[PDB]
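Example 4.3 (complexes with small molecules)
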Amino acid sequence: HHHHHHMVHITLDRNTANSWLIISKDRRQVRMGDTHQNVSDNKERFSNYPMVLGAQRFSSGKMYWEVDVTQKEAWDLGVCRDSVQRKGQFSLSPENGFWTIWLWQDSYEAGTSPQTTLHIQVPPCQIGIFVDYEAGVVSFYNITDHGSLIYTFSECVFAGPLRPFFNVGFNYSGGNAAPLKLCPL
Ligand SMILES: CCOc1ccccc1N1CCNCC1
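Answer. The structure with 1-(2-ethoxyphenyl)piperazine bound is encoded below.
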């Protein structure tokens, strides 16, 4: 791909974070803490999952960013509507306002309903996310494998402003403590 030139500087929005998340001072890294992080509750926080949004809102244009997933066992990445449900249980689907891929139990899947199997020969350590608002496209790239395509959602119905979306995953195993990191441009 030649999408790198639409690079945007993403930072994480503390106010949207699940109360167990720890966001770095520079707002570029997030990990699961071992306990509640001593913040007050608010209507923006994701309550059932270790999720957080980017601060940036997009309603037009082409945008690209990269995320480091090194040594993680489980995570979700992509974009979502600003108006997604924050409280209780829900599935990641375009019908619910999410355009995502994930790693879970040694397999990669796209968050369609039902989910779609991904075919990745080189497990990625960094993922590139490309959004073309006008075209209705969200694409995922394997930076570890020379930028090879992972998945494209097309004919997307964004239906409002979009925010970068992250899930660091639980750490029931003791093997998923590593952070998600936004990579430099
Ligand atoms: C591990 C302690 O639990 C959480 C920690 C952070 C977010 C959600 C949960 N729950 C929500 C209720 N179901 C169990 C996990």
